[PDB]
Write a protein that binds this ligand. Sequence first.
Ligand SMILES: *[C@@H]1O[C@H](CO)[C@@H](O)[C@H](O)[C@H]1NC(C)=O
Ligand SMILES: *[C@@H]1O[C@H](CO)[C@@H](O)[C@H](O)[C@H]1NC(C)=O
Ligand SMILES: *[C@@H]1O[C@H](CO)[C@@H](O)[C@H](O)[C@H]1NC(C)=O
Ligand SMILES: *[C@@H]1O[C@H](CO)[C@@H](O)[C@H](O)[C@H]1NC(C)=O
Lengths: 88, 49, 22
Amino acid sequence: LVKNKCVNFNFNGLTGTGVLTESNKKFLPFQQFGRDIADTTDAVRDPQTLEILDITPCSFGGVSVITPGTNTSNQVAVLYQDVNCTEV
Amino acid sequence: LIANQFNSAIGKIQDSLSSTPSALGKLQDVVNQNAQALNTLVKQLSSNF
Amino acid sequence: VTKFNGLTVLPPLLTDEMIAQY
Ligand SMILES: *[C@@H]1O[C@H](CO)[C@@H](O)[C@H](O)[C@H]1NC(C)=O
Ligand SMILES: *[C@@H]1O[C@H](CO)[C@@H](O)[C@H](O)[C@H]1NC(C)=O
Ligand SMILES: *[C@@H]1O[C@H](CO)[C@@H](O)[C@H](O)[C@H]1NC(C)=O
Ligand SMILES: *[C@@H]1O[C@H](CO)[C@@H](O)[C@H](O)[C@H]1NC(C)=O
């Protein structure tokens, strides 16, 4: 089991990819899948243990180049939108 | 008298905003419409087409 | 007043704090 790291997961056929963390939400004993309002997988119970694992999508976002005019300078700054830069 | 009427009017504005659930109807409708459009867009993935 | 499948919600440039300041 790998958690807090983006990984391709296949729990009996979820065949999805994302970042898995410990879940405080309490499933029902018969329930396995998890879903949000928009009907996308949001949590899966571990087929081996009682633990519930959230599924957050692998961090993505646009890359914006922050530059002054090329006449003024040639230095640029890069913005990774909505991304924690522990994982850039 | 004008000052008291002004203060009481603002107080009544505060109370009427607090009471009526649909006071901010326009803003709530804008938010609901945007969220509903996004929800429809995401739900459209489930369609076989 | 009161689903990440390629959707990004860009934050407003003026935060509510500076809108309140204006
Ligand atoms: C059940 O799964 C856990 C996973 O950590 C494993 O340690 C254990 O050996 C398995 N079997 C039993 C009987 O607990
Ligand atoms: C670069 O060009 C812009 C637009 O023509 C101008 O406003 C700016 O002053 C220029 N900078 C320099 C250092 O010439
Ligand atoms: C980025 O991750 C670190 C990990 O400790 C966390 O403390 C920080 O709040 C995160 N940043 C954002 C914007 O979520
Ligand atoms: C100003 O008048 C209002 C009445 O609407 C009152 O709520 C507030 O306490 C007053 N503030 C003062 C007297 O400093």
